Amino acid sequence: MASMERFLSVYDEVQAFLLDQLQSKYEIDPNRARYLRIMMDTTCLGGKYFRGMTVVNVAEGFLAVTQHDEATKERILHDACVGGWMIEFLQAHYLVEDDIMDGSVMRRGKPCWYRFPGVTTQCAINDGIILKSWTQIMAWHYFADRPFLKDLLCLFQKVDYATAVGQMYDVTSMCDSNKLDPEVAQPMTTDFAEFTPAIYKRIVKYKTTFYTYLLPLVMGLLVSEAAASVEMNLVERVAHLIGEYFQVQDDVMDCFTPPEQLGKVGTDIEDAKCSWLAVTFLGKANAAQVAEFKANYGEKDPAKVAVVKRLYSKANLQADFAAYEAEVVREVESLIEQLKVKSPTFAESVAVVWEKTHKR
Amino acid sequence: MASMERFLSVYDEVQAFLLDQLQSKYEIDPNRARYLRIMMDTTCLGGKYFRGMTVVNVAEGFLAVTQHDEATKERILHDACVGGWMIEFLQAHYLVEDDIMDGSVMRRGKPCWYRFPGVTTQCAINDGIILKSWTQIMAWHYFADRPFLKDLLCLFQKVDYATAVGQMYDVTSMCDSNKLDPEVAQPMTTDFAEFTPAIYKRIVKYKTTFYTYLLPLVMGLLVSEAAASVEMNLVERVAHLIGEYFQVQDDVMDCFTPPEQLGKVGTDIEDAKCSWLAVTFLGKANAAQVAEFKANYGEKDPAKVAVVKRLYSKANLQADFAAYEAEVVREVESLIEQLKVKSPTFAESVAVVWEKTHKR
Ligand SMILES: O=C(NNc1ccccc1F)c1ccno1
Ligand SMILES: O=C(NNc1ccccc1F)c1ccno1
Ligand SMILES: O=C(NNc1ccccc1F)c1ccno1
Ligand SMILES: O=C(NNc1ccccc1F)c1ccno1
Ligand SMILES: [Zn+2]
Ligand SMILES: [Zn+2]
Ligand SMILES: [Zn+2]
Ligand SMILES: [Zn+2]
Q: Concatenated DSSP letters for A151-215?
A: HHHHHHHHHHHHHHHHHHHHHTTTB-GGG--TTSPPPBPSS-TT-SHHHHHHHHIIIIIIIIIIH
**Of all atoms in ligand 1, which is nearest to the CA of residue A10?**
7
Resolution in A: 1.6
B140 contacts in chain A (CB < 8 Å): 154, 157
| Nearest residue by C-alpha to atom 1 in ligand 3 | B8
Look at residue B160 and give its three-state secondary structure.
helix
Range of the domain at A325: 1-360
User: Residue B184 and residue A153: Cα distance in Å, rounded?
Assistant: 38
What kind and span of H or E run contains B61?
A: helix B50-63
Tally of domains within chain A: 1
Note whether B97 and A126 are within 8 A (CB): yes
CB contact under 8 A, A168 and B130: yes
Asked whether the CA dihedral B225, B231, B232, B238 is positive or negative, the reply is negative
Question: Which of B9, B15, B43, when mutated, tests ligand 3's pocket best, judged by the most ligand atoms within 8 Å of its CB?
Answer: B9
User: Residue B195 and residue B107: Cα distance in Å, rounded?
Assistant: 27
Note whether B231 and B205 are within 8 A (CB): no
A198 burial (CB, 10 Å; 0-12 / 13-18 / 19+) is: exposed
**Of all atoms in ligand 4, which is nearest to the CA of residue B327?**
13
Rounded to 10 deg, the angle between the B149-171 and A120-142 helix axes is 150
Name residue B106's beta-bridge partners.
B111
Note whether A111 and A150 are within 8 A (CB): no
A89 burial (CB, 10 Å; 0-12 / 13-18 / 19+) is: buried
Name residue B188's beta-bridge partners.
B175
Does B2 contact ligand 3 (Cβ within 6 A)?
no
Note whether A35 and B177 are within 8 A (CB): no
Longest CA–CA separation in chain B, Å: 69
Q: Concatenated DSSP letters for A290-340?
A: HHHHHHHTT---HHHHHHHHHHHHHTTHHHHHHHHHHHHHHHHHHHHHHHH
Give the CATH number for residue B330: 1.10.600.10
Q: Is B104 left (phi over 0), alpha (psi -120 to 50) or beta?
A: beta
Does B12 contact ligand 3 (Cβ within 6 A)?
yes
Which residues are CB-contacts of A158 (< 8 A; sequence separation ≥ 6)?
A: A210
Any residues with Cβ below 6 Å from ligand 2, and which?
A 197, 200-201, 276, 279-280, 283, 320, 323-324
Smallest Cα distance from B328 to chain A, Å: 22
Does B13 contact ligand 3 (Cβ within 6 A)?
no
Q: Which amino acid is at B112?
A: C
Does B47 contact ligand 3 (Cβ within 6 A)?
no
Residue B338: CB atoms within 10 A of its CB come to 15
Name residue A107's beta-bridge partners.
A110
Residue ranges at the known binding site of B: 98, 102, 170, 236, 250, 254, 268
User: Residue A296 and residue A301: Cα distance in Å, rounded?
Assistant: 9
User: Residue B106 and residue B297: Cα distance in Å, rounded?
Assistant: 22
User: Residue A48 and residue A45: Cα distance in Å, rounded?
Assistant: 9
Any residues with Cβ below 6 Å from ligand 4, and which?
B 197, 200-201, 276, 279-280, 283, 320, 323-324
Smallest Cα distance from A227 to chain B, Å: 20
The residue count of chain A comes to: 360
User: Residue A347 and residue A238: Cα distance in Å, rounded?
Assistant: 10
User: Residue B311 and residue B289: Cα distance in Å, rounded?
Assistant: 7
The residue count of chain B comes to: 360
**Of all atoms in ligand 3, which is nearest to the CA of residue B12?**
16
A205 burial (CB, 10 Å; 0-12 / 13-18 / 19+) is: buried
Which residues are CB-contacts of A121 (< 8 A; sequence separation ≥ 6)?
A: A100, A114, B100, B101
Name residue A188's beta-bridge partners.
A175
User: Residue A41 and residue B148: Cα distance in Å, rounded?
Assistant: 36
Note whether B312 and B277 are within 8 A (CB): yes
Q: In the Cβ-directed half-sphere of B130, how many Cα atoms lie within 13 Å?
A: 23
User: Residue A79 and residue A97: Cα distance in Å, rounded?
Assistant: 27
- What is the distance in A from the centroid of ligand 8 to the CA of A116? 27
Select from B239, B309, B238 the least CA-distant residue to B268. Answer: B309
Does A7 contact ligand 1 (Cβ within 6 A)?
no
**What long-range pairs does A331-334 form, CB within 8 A, spacing at least 24?**
A331/A241, A332/A238, A332/A241, A332/A242, A332/A245
Longest CA–CA separation in chain A, Å: 69
